[PDB]
Amino acid sequence: EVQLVESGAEVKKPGSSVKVSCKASGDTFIRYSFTWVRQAPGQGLEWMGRIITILDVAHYAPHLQGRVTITADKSTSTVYLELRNLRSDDTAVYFCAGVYEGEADEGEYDNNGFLKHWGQGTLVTVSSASTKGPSVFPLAPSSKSTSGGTAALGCLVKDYFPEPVTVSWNSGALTSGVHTFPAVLQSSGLYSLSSVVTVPSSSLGTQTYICNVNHKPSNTKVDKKVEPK
Amino acid sequence: LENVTENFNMWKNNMVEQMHEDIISLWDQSLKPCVKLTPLCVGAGSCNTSVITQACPKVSFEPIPIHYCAPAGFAILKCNDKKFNGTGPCTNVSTVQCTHGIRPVVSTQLLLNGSLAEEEIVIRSENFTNNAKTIIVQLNESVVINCTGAGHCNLSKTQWENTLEQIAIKLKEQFGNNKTIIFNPSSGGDPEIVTHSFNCGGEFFYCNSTQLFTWNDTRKLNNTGRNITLPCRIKQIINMWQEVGKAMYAPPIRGQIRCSSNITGLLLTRDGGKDTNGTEIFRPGGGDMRDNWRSELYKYKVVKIE
Ligand SMILES: *[C@@H]1O[C@H](CO)[C@@H](O)[C@H](O)[C@H]1NC(C)=O
Ligand SMILES: *[C@@H]1O[C@H](CO)[C@@H](O)[C@H](O)[C@H]1NC(C)=O
Ligand SMILES: *[C@@H]1O[C@H](CO)[C@@H](O)[C@H](O)[C@H]1NC(C)=O
Ligand SMILES: *[C@@H]1O[C@H](CO)[C@@H](O)[C@H](O)[C@H]1NC(C)=O
Ligand SMILES: *[C@@H]1O[C@H](CO)[C@@H](O)[C@H](O)[C@H]1NC(C)=O
Ligand SMILES: *[C@@H]1O[C@H](CO)[C@@H](O)[C@H](O)[C@H]1NC(C)=O
Ligand SMILES: *[C@@H]1O[C@H](CO)[C@@H](O)[C@H](O)[C@H]1NC(C)=O
Ligand SMILES: *[C@@H]1O[C@H](CO)[C@@H](O)[C@H](O)[C@H]1NC(C)=O
Ligand SMILES: *[C@@H]1O[C@H](CO)[C@@H](O)[C@H](O)[C@H]1NC(C)=O
Ligand SMILES: *[C@@H]1O[C@H](CO)[C@@H](O)[C@H](O)[C@H]1NC(C)=O
Ligand SMILES: *[C@H]1O[C@H](CO)[C@@H](O)[C@H](O)[C@H]1NC(C)=O
Ligand SMILES: *[C@H]1O[C@H](CO)[C@@H](O)[C@H](O)[C@H]1NC(C)=O
């Protein structure tokens, strides 16, 4: 019963090359055939290829032949996936996936296409943009729109890169009744999401609202006071 | 029979190489691997592996007998004798159209469905003195052996015990009567050579032949066993006999694979011992499918018209 570990998410620029690692542990390495399955944001699984490890042979996906390679280091027990000539569309979460094959070290081999063990997934952003912390802008609580019960307000993390971004309200307390939207890619090449929390108006002016946005990539942690302005 | 005296050399017979090459091509259009790896070097040590991936159709490869008829400008000469070394001057030679029907069975250690020895058990060898040259045994009475994809083969403990005797006796009758004859399992090497490998239903069986080659010219092994059961195993990743390189075949599928072949001969290979006391140790051998072909063409030789 193996556990697959992957290399870190990498931000590569167009026309470049990226190599993602995948540590295989918990069982006999050569008894597994590993497959890389990529998935672009919003998109769905796309078979990238599979390496019949023990044999050290790997077959690939038509639309990738030439620009992709799958190799395995039996010594360190790792599998690698290399894509060269990166395009923007290559931007996706590259999954490492494996399946048991049988006493392959003994000649037995099921050569299974499905994937029983999956990796945590490694994200690769292939874009011409540059790493840059975000900028949080408070969303004035609808004081002249909603009343009587509760009012909704929030933040607007705009122009950040590469990804991803975490969000919490009031240092991490008011995480309830909040709808943090998936980021969105702007024409510039940057992303921008939004976080909101519909809370009672009678609490505007005592509980200084502050969304806590973090962006490890840029190593820029931001806090913004959402005063009922 | 032909009224003339000619030379024969099964160990340098050319039909062997002509059939072998045929049997290989009889394999490239019947049993095609999903992947085939083969060495590729320029000589500079470094050796890339040439990979090939083709369809892997499950076919129940069932060998058809093969005849060998001389065309024209050519004639086949057959040797006739109850005990022919297959390497020398044959007295009762005789020209024939086609050689007897031969079922190109590819296997190691045991020769299956071959041709039995008319008289008694005969053992040929390009040089018995050389502990490197395979000894081809020829049974005069075959020993049925049934293998199944279920994981094993059954053999008559009786018949096999006898056989080892009527073989062990033909051995010392060549290396010295006052010499003890012993049988041990493979010394080592590839799975295909270390076990009794062969193909059945297109499945590459690998039967452990320890119980067949652990016979001491003293004791027995029939305590609570009527039949010998070799623990066989079907492999998908195998070393090719046609050429250095591995090859992966697709897993088994037919609800049942079964074989019932005639152990018509063996391929032994005694160990040197460096002239040590009379204690010749013979072990399973083969892996060079030509010896097989040989065991069938040992008494033939095609020749050009005069
Ligand atoms: C690999 O083998 C090829 C033979 O096709 C040879 O030309 C090359 O120098 C070797 N090195 C590589 C590419 O690994
Ligand atoms: C050869 O076969 C006959 C029966 O076909 C058997 O009686 C004889 O003993 C065999 N010769 C030996 C011992 O190799
Ligand atoms: C092998 O199978 C045959 C039928 O093909 C049977 O007659 C024979 O008894 C079997 N031999 C064994 C299991 O020893
Ligand atoms: C065997 O060798 C000879 C036969 O050549 C025989 O006279 C002798 O007594 C025997 N000695 C042995 C090796 O036991
Ligand atoms: C079967 O063969 C293996 C090696 O191939 C050997 O080590 C083992 O002891 C054998 N088992 C039997 C049936 O004696
Ligand atoms: C051969 O002899 C050895 C030791 O004398 C014994 O362990 C082995 O079982 C014998 N082979 C058989 C099974 O006949
Ligand atoms: C040894 O076992 C075989 C069957 O495996 C049997 O036919 C034979 O009679 C046994 N040996 C004796 C004579 O006790
Ligand atoms: C050849 O093998 C079959 C399979 O067990 C057997 O039944 C048949 O009698 C054998 N025929 C020969 C060559 O004697
Ligand atoms: C001849 O030997 C082959 C071994 O490959 C076996 O599969 C076949 O069944 C034998 N002949 C018969 C009785 O069908
Ligand atoms: C043959 O047996 C051993 C072989 O290892 C050897 O030491 C011995 O001198 C020879 N003769 C005997 C004692 O049987
Ligand atoms: C066949 O017999 C004739 C008798 O005249 C003889 O000349 C010839 O050499 C013989 N051939 C054989 C079998 O050696
Ligand atoms: C071959 O010819 C010799 C010489 O007469 C004879 O002794 C032998 O029986 C013949 N062999 C056969 C049966 O073809």
Coordinates of C-alpha atoms in Angstrom, one line a residue, chain A residues 21-223:
Chain A
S21 CA 9.2 14.5 -9.0
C22 CA 7.2 11.8 -7.4
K23 CA 8.5 9.8 -4.5
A24 CA 7.0 6.3 -4.3
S25 CA 7.1 4.7 -0.9
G26 CA 5.3 2.1 1.1
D27 CA 5.9 -0.9 -1.2
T28 CA 8.0 -2.4 -4.0
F29 CA 8.7 0.3 -6.5
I30 CA 9.4 -1.9 -9.5
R31 CA 6.0 -3.6 -9.0
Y32 CA 4.3 -0.4 -10.0
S33 CA 3.7 1.3 -13.3
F34 CA 3.3 5.0 -12.9
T35 CA 1.2 7.4 -14.9
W36 CA 1.1 11.2 -15.1
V37 CA -2.3 12.7 -15.4
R38 CA -2.5 16.5 -15.8
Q39 CA -5.6 18.6 -15.3
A40 CA -5.9 22.3 -16.3
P41 CA -7.9 24.6 -14.1
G42 CA -11.6 24.1 -14.6
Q43 CA -10.6 21.4 -17.1
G44 CA -10.6 17.6 -16.7
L45 CA -8.1 14.8 -16.5
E46 CA -5.9 14.3 -19.6
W47 CA -3.7 11.2 -19.8
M48 CA -0.1 12.3 -20.2
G49 CA 1.6 8.9 -20.3
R50 CA 2.7 5.9 -18.3
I51 CA 6.0 4.3 -17.4
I52 CA 6.2 0.5 -17.1
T53 CA 8.8 1.2 -14.5
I54 CA 10.5 -2.2 -14.2
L55 CA 11.0 -2.3 -18.0
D56 CA 12.0 1.4 -18.0
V57 CA 9.7 1.9 -21.0
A58 CA 7.1 4.6 -21.2
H59 CA 4.5 5.4 -23.8
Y60 CA 3.0 8.9 -24.2
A61 CA -0.1 10.9 -25.2
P62 CA -0.3 11.8 -28.9
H63 CA -0.6 15.5 -28.4
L64 CA 2.5 15.4 -26.1
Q65 CA 4.9 13.0 -27.9
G66 CA 8.1 14.8 -28.3
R67 CA 7.6 17.4 -25.6
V68 CA 7.1 15.0 -22.7
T69 CA 9.1 12.3 -20.9
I70 CA 8.6 10.0 -18.1
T71 CA 11.6 8.4 -16.3
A72 CA 12.1 6.6 -13.0
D73 CA 15.1 6.4 -10.6
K74 CA 14.7 2.9 -9.0
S75 CA 17.6 3.8 -6.7
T76 CA 15.9 6.7 -5.0
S77 CA 12.5 5.3 -5.8
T78 CA 11.3 8.3 -7.8
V79 CA 9.3 8.9 -10.9
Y80 CA 9.7 12.1 -13.0
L81 CA 7.6 13.9 -15.5
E82 CA 9.3 16.4 -17.9
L83 CA 7.5 18.7 -20.3
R84 CA 9.6 20.9 -22.6
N85 CA 8.5 23.9 -24.7
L86 CA 5.9 24.9 -22.1
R87 CA 2.8 26.7 -23.4
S88 CA 0.3 28.6 -21.3
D89 CA -2.3 25.8 -21.8
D90 CA 0.2 23.4 -20.2
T91 CA -0.6 25.3 -17.0
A92 CA -2.3 22.6 -14.9
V93 CA -2.1 20.4 -11.9
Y94 CA 0.1 17.5 -12.8
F95 CA -0.8 14.4 -10.9
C96 CA 1.4 11.4 -10.3
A97 CA -0.5 8.2 -10.3
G98 CA 0.4 4.6 -9.9
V99 CA -1.0 1.0 -9.9
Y100 CA 0.3 -2.3 -8.7
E101 CA 1.3 -4.7 -11.5
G102 CA 2.0 -8.0 -9.8
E103 CA 5.3 -9.8 -9.0
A104 CA 6.8 -7.9 -11.8
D105 CA 10.3 -8.5 -10.2
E106 CA 9.4 -12.1 -11.0
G107 CA 8.1 -11.8 -14.6
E108 CA 4.4 -11.4 -13.7
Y109 CA 2.9 -8.2 -15.0
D110 CA -0.8 -7.2 -15.3
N111 CA 0.0 -4.0 -17.2
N112 CA -3.0 -2.1 -15.8
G113 CA -4.2 1.1 -17.3
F114 CA -6.2 2.4 -14.3
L115 CA -4.5 4.2 -11.5
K116 CA -5.1 3.1 -7.9
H117 CA -2.6 5.4 -6.2
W118 CA -2.6 9.0 -6.8
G119 CA -0.2 11.8 -5.9
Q120 CA -1.0 14.9 -4.0
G121 CA -0.7 16.8 -7.3
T122 CA 1.9 19.3 -8.4
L123 CA 0.7 22.6 -10.0
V124 CA 2.7 24.1 -12.8
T125 CA 2.0 27.6 -14.0
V126 CA 3.4 28.3 -17.5
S127 CA 2.9 32.0 -18.1
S128 CA 4.8 35.1 -19.1
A129 CA 3.8 36.9 -15.9
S130 CA 6.1 37.5 -12.9
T131 CA 5.7 36.6 -9.2
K132 CA 4.0 39.4 -7.4
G133 CA 2.1 39.6 -4.1
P134 CA -1.5 40.7 -4.2
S135 CA -3.3 43.8 -3.1
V136 CA -6.4 43.6 -0.9
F137 CA -9.2 46.1 -1.3
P138 CA -12.1 46.2 1.2
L139 CA -15.7 45.9 -0.1
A140 CA -17.8 48.5 1.7
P141 CA -20.6 46.5 3.6
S142 CA -23.9 47.3 1.9
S143 CA -25.1 49.8 4.5
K144 CA -27.3 51.6 2.0
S145 CA -28.4 48.3 0.3
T146 CA -29.1 45.7 2.9
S147 CA -30.4 46.0 6.5
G148 CA -32.9 44.6 9.0
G149 CA -30.9 41.4 9.5
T150 CA -27.4 41.1 8.2
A151 CA -25.3 42.7 5.5
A152 CA -22.6 41.3 3.3
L153 CA -19.1 42.7 2.8
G154 CA -15.7 41.4 1.9
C155 CA -12.3 41.7 0.2
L156 CA -11.1 41.8 -3.4
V157 CA -7.6 40.2 -3.7
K158 CA -6.7 41.7 -7.0
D159 CA -3.7 41.3 -9.3
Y160 CA -1.7 38.5 -7.7
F161 CA 0.5 35.7 -9.1
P162 CA 1.2 32.8 -9.5
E163 CA -1.0 30.8 -7.1
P164 CA -2.6 29.9 -4.9
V165 CA -4.1 32.1 -2.2
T166 CA -5.6 31.4 1.2
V167 CA -8.3 33.6 2.9
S168 CA -9.6 33.9 6.4
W169 CA -11.6 36.6 8.2
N170 CA -10.8 38.3 11.6
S171 CA -7.3 36.7 12.0
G172 CA -9.0 33.4 11.3
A173 CA -12.1 33.6 13.5
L174 CA -15.0 34.5 11.2
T175 CA -14.4 31.8 8.7
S176 CA -18.1 30.9 8.9
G177 CA -20.7 32.4 6.5
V178 CA -17.9 33.3 4.0
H179 CA -17.8 32.6 0.3
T180 CA -14.3 32.9 -1.0
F181 CA -14.5 32.7 -4.8
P182 CA -12.0 30.8 -7.0
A183 CA -9.5 33.2 -8.4
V184 CA -9.9 34.3 -12.0
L185 CA -7.2 34.9 -14.6
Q186 CA -7.2 38.5 -15.9
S187 CA -6.0 39.3 -19.4
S188 CA -2.8 40.8 -17.8
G189 CA -1.8 37.2 -16.9
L190 CA -2.6 37.8 -13.2
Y191 CA -5.4 36.3 -11.1
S192 CA -7.9 37.9 -8.8
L193 CA -10.5 36.4 -6.5
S194 CA -12.8 37.7 -3.8
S195 CA -13.9 36.8 -0.3
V196 CA -17.1 37.8 1.3
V197 CA -19.0 37.3 4.6
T198 CA -22.7 38.1 5.1
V199 CA -22.8 39.2 8.8
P200 CA -25.3 41.2 10.9
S201 CA -25.1 45.0 10.4
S202 CA -25.6 45.6 14.2
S203 CA -22.0 44.4 14.5
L204 CA -20.5 47.0 12.2
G205 CA -18.4 49.4 14.3
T206 CA -17.3 47.1 17.1
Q207 CA -15.9 44.0 15.3
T208 CA -13.2 45.5 13.0
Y209 CA -13.5 43.2 10.0
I210 CA -10.2 42.1 8.4
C211 CA -9.7 39.5 5.7
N212 CA -6.4 37.7 6.1
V213 CA -4.9 37.1 2.7
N214 CA -1.7 35.1 2.2
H215 CA 0.3 34.4 -0.9
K216 CA 3.3 32.2 0.1
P217 CA 4.7 32.4 -3.5
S218 CA 5.4 36.1 -3.2
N219 CA 5.9 35.6 0.5
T220 CA 3.5 38.5 1.0
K221 CA 0.9 38.2 3.8
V222 CA -1.7 41.0 3.8
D223 CA -4.3 42.2 6.3

